[PDB]
Amino acid sequence: MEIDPKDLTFLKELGTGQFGVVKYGKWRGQYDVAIRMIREGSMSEDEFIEEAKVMMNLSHEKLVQLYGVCTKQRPIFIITEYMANGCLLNYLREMRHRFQTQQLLEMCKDVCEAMEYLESKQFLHRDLAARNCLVNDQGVVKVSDFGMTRYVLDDEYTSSTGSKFPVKWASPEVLMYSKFSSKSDIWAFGVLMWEIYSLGKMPYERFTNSETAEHIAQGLRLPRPHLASERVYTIMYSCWHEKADERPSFKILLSNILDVMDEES
Numbered sequence: 001m002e003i004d005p006k007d008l009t010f011l012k013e014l015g016t017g018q019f020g021v022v023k024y025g026k027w028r029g030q031y032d033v034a035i036r037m038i039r040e041g042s043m044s045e046d047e048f049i050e051e052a053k054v055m056m057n058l059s060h061e062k063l064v065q066l067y068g069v070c071t072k073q074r075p076i077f078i079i080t081e082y083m084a085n086g087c088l089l090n091y092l093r094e095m096r097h098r099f100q101t102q103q104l105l106e107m108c109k110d111v112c113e114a115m116e117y118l119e120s121k122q123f124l125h126r127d128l129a130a131r132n133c134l135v136n137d138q139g140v141v142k143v144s145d146f147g148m149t150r151y152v153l154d155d156e157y158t159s160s161t162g163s164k165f166p167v168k169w170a171s172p173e174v175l176m177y178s179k180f181s182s183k184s185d186i187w188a189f190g191v192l193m194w195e196i197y198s199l200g201k202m203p204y205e206r207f208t209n210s211e212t213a214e215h216i217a218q219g220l221r222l223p224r225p226h227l228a229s230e231r232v233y234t235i236m237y238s239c240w241h242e243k244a245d246e247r248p249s250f251k252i253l254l255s256n257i258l259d260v261m262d263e264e265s
């Protein structure tokens with residue numbers, strides 16, 4: 001819903017992200033929030049604003065909430081639930097010796113639940129990766145920046161061969177046909193699981209985007225992480241079926257996750 005900046009306070013700088021500067025602050029006094037100032041020239045504003053009202057109506061505990069927006073000025077402001085521990089990728093790397101596999105599987109339940117809610121609303125992410133997931137003060141993981149890639153003007157960020165396109169998280173049908181589906185978000189979730197159990201290592205770190213695309217196209221798949229059990233690996237590997245219809249839905253995935261958690265007792 002629209003927010004009068006009168007009701008906001010800027011308290012600290014969190015840094016500049018892919019879509020502009022971000023700061024920590026307070027909304028209506030009692031709400032810790034992160035206000036992002038949208039880089040000018042980066043977004044299709046009208047389309048993004050209209051879709052923002054939709055992402056406002058998406059609510060789930062494991063999804064970084066959108067509390068409102070300031071659109072009658074530029075740069076547009078986006079007021080979101082504040083995640084004290086920052087990006088999940090850097091959270092994974094900083095506490096490399098402080099995560100037990102039970103906490104890792106928890107982080108996977110969190111992501112899978114958020115993506116199952118997004119699946120059930122027939123809403124696509126289009127860029128699921130650890131760098132777009134955030135962690136709050138209680139170690140809980142939440143998805144964010146969902147559907148944001150739909151509104152980027154830079155063609156490098158959108159085209160299959162763009163220099164900034166996340167090939168290493170993309171399914172074969174996204175690289176070859178630009179066919180986005182919940183199944184491509186599932187492929188991406190598989191890669192994300194690999195990020196989690198790898199404690200934040202870059203998938204195919206030493207591959208050019210092209211080399212990755214071709215290897216993926218010919219059957220190469222990420223190696224089982226050291227901290228991943230044969231059951232966890234089975235789940236993230238099942239996310240990477242060549243045939244989209246052969247990949248299990250996020251609901252079936254969450255169930256498998258819960259089965260592994262139960263067997264981890």
Ligand SMILES: Nc1ncnc2[nH]nc(-c3ccc(Oc4ccccc4)cc3)c12
Pocket residue numbers: 014017022034035036055064065066078080081082083084086087134144145146148
């Ligand atoms: N919410 C944060 N909490 C702590 N640190 C942070 N750094 N950056 C952000 C951030 C802020 C706004 C934002 O817009 C959104 C929000 C939800 C969905 C899509 C887009 C996406 C990310 C952030």
